[PDB]
């Protein structure tokens, strides 16, 4: 789209790899460090996709 289409999304952060021909639709905050993330957008807790 000329303005910009956001319908196409990609997963960037994930704990482990993907086995062949395997799909993952989960969307949960991924822990970068030792700190708990009970669901936040703050330090070391980032959206996966």
């Amino acid at each position: 789209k000329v303005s910009g289409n956001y319908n196409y999304l990609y997963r960037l952060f994930r704990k482990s790899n993907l086995k062949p021909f395997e799909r993952d639709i989960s969307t949960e905050i991924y822990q970068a460090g030792n700190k708990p993330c009970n669901g936040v957008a703050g330090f070391n807790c980032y959206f996966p996709l």
Binding site: K19, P20, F21, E22, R23, D24, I25, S26
Partner: protein
């Protein structure tokens, strides 16, 4: 035994399987399911089995797979003692393909039971391109 449930969390957070025999067909659903604590289709009377509580899941959000095919052999009514039927399956998912191998044998006359002896080979039944993660399973008494 009506079927099986396969998954990893079974809490509408990750997609899951649901295989169950009914009517004169089979239904296999791959979907995000909010499974209840106790999975059954038993309960509506005292003893004559009822297919009550058809929706063992509270709700069914965005699904991915639907499939209906020819059912398996059925045993009518309820009989106790001298169980003449044995049904054995193997379930395995590799490369995003779910494989179920099925085998049925009649005239089991072993009263003490305890998983029969001898030898029998299993034939391929169906392959499903499900493509999800799998960690834990149950059995759907119903």
């Amino acid at each position: 035994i009506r079927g099986w449930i396969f998954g990893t969390t079974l809490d509408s957070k990750t997609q899951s399987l649901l295989i169950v025999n009914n009517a004169t067909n089979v239904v296999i659903k791959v979907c995000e399911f909010q499974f209840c604590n106790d999975p059954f289709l038993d309960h509506k009377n005292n003893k004559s089995w009822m297919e009550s509580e058809f929706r063992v899941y509270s709700s069914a959000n965005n699904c991915t797979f639907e499939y209906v095919s020819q059912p398996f052999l059925m045993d009518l009514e309820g009989k106790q003692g001298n169980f003449k039927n044995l049904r054995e399956f193997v379930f395995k998912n590799i490369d995003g393909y779910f494989k179920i191998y099925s085998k049925h044998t009649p005239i089991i006359v072993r009263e003490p039971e305890d998983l029969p002896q001898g030898f029998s080979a299993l034939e391929p039944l169906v392959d499903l391109p499900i493509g999800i993660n799998i960690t834990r399973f149950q059995t759907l008494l119903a």
